[PDB]
From Swiss-Prot:
Subunit description: Trimer. Interacts with the polymerase alpha catalytic subunit POLA1. Interacts with MCM10. Interacts with DNA2. Interacts with CDC45 and GINS2 subunit of GINS complex; these interactions associate WDHD1 with the CMG helicase complex.
Protein known as: WD repeat and HMG-box DNA-binding protein 1
Organism expressing this protein natively: Homo sapiens (Human)
Subcellular location: Nucleus, Nucleoplasm
Gene, per the UniProt record: WDHD1
Role description: Core replisome component that acts as a replication initiation factor. Binds directly to the CMG complex and functions as a hub to recruit additional proteins to the replication fork.
Coiled-coil parts of chain: none
Length: 305
């Protein structure tokens, strides 16, 4: 039986919209350009709990009861979650940040901004910060190595780079992306993702494929492709076991692969063809939540049934 696509529902105003599951897996958590973070029981929840994090949210990450958001006063801030108690400011940039992520155990965050910088900050001690310098245009996306050795970044300068966290050096850079000056002009936000457990592979959406590179050697392993992908892939996310990978395209396609066998497990088309800009795998079940550039929220169930 194929994955069942519940009907998408309105989540936020139009614009970039992110999604994850809460720590328990019982809730879907979205954040959007209206500056709200919404907490949904499911897609039938007509009264989701809200956290007003600012006038506009660019990105949100959630781990172990800490909600970290990039908002339009150029700060990276913290709230407790789901309570929503303000818990301070972790760092700032001279412009907005475009992505913020937690590391594997939730003790660190990384953020990337339109002033080209990447910063890692200790969640419990904002005085502990590391800055990664080298990108020549806005940073689009970040992903932590689960082994806490490396951090990957994708940028409007056309590069995907891997950084060594301990000394902030650049271990490798692949010129895989199209160049542009502003995030609004990016063909793809290239929401790349490290493989969860071993971190053996880094998955990068590039044109109509997902490219898999091996850690430490930075060698290309193989690509995941499909005849149904007709427009650029925007975002990937792994199943928590590291065995499956989902990708979302700029024209609304969601596709799932078994990464070991490269078998295609699922394909789901967006009814209106909006770009997938948020995508998340449930922590324990075959369930994938996703959000699109129009602010809508969807849910796939019985994934890889």
């Amino acid at each position: 039986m194929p994955a069942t696509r519940k009907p998408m529902r309105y989540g936020h105003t139009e614009g970039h919209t992110e999604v994850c599951f809460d720590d328990s897996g019982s809730f879907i958590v979205t954040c959007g350009s209206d500056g709200d973070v919404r907490i949904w029981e499911d897609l039938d929840d007509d009264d989701p709990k809200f956290i007003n994090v600012g006038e506009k949210a660019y990105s949100c990450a959630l781990k172990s009861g800490k909600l970290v958001t990039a908002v339009s006063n150029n700060t990276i801030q913290v709230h407790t979650f789901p309570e929503g108690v303000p818990d301070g400011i972790l760092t700032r940039f001279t412009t907005n940040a475009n992505h913020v992520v937690f590391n594997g155990d939730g003790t660190k965050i990384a953020a990337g901004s339109s002033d080209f910088l990447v910063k890692i900050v200790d969640v419990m001690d904002s005085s502990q910060q590391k800055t990664f310098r080298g990108h020549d245009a806005p940073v689009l996306s970040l992903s932590f190595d689960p082994k806490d050795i490396f951090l990957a970044s994708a940028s409007c300068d056309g590069s995907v780079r891997v950084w060594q966290i301990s000394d902030q050096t650049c271990a490798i850079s692949w010129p895989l992306l199209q160049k542009c000056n502003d995030v609004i002009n990016a063909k793809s936000i290239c929401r790349l993702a490290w493989q969860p457990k071993s971190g053996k592979l880094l998955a990068i959406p590039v044109e109509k494929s997902v490219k898999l590179y091996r850690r430490e050697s930075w060698s290309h392993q193989f690509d995941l492709s499909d005849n149904f992908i007709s427009q650029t892939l925007n975002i990937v996310t792994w199943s928590p076991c590291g065995q499956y990978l989902a990708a979302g395209s700029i024209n609304g396609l969601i596709i799932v692969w078994n990464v070991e066998t490269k078998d295609c497990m699922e394909r789901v088309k967006h009814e209106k063809g909006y770009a997938i800009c948020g995508l998340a795998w449930h922590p324990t079940c075959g369930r994938i939540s996703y959000t699109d550039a129009e602010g809508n929220l969807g849910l796939l169930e019985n994934v890889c049934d």
